[PDB]
Amino acid sequence: VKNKCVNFNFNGLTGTGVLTESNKKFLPFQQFGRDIADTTDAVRDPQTL
Amino acid sequence: KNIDGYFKIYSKHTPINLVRDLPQGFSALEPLVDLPIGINITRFQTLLA
């Protein structure tokens, strides 16, 4: 579910946020993105890439 | 590279026109594959056709 306040855990990361589609293109190896403060801001969805 | 019980491989396929020596430049090395081998490796040899 996207664009909605949901408590989520991807691969057990945990946290609360708003899931939105991202135009940024991860490199194939990467799974987790992070912000300047080393806080998780972007993730790669486990079930569907 | 072998780290934390894992054996990782990197790659790059940059095209160059200077045959003499190593080109000034910057190619990053992405992690191609990861595999959990984990050996206390001490020696090294290459195989030439």
What residues of B are in contact with residue A27 (Cβ under 8 Å)? 30
What is the rounded distance in angstroms from the CA atom of residue B39 to the CA atom of residue A35? 35
Within 10 angstroms of residue B7's Cβ, the number of other Cβ atoms is: 15
Q: Report yes or no: B14 and B25 within 8 Å, Cβ to Cβ.
A: yes
Method: cryo-EM
Closest CA to A30 of B4, B30, B41, B26: B30
Interface test with B, best of A25, A26, A27, A29 (most B CBs within 10 A): A29
How many beta-carbon pairs below 8 A join chains A and B? 4
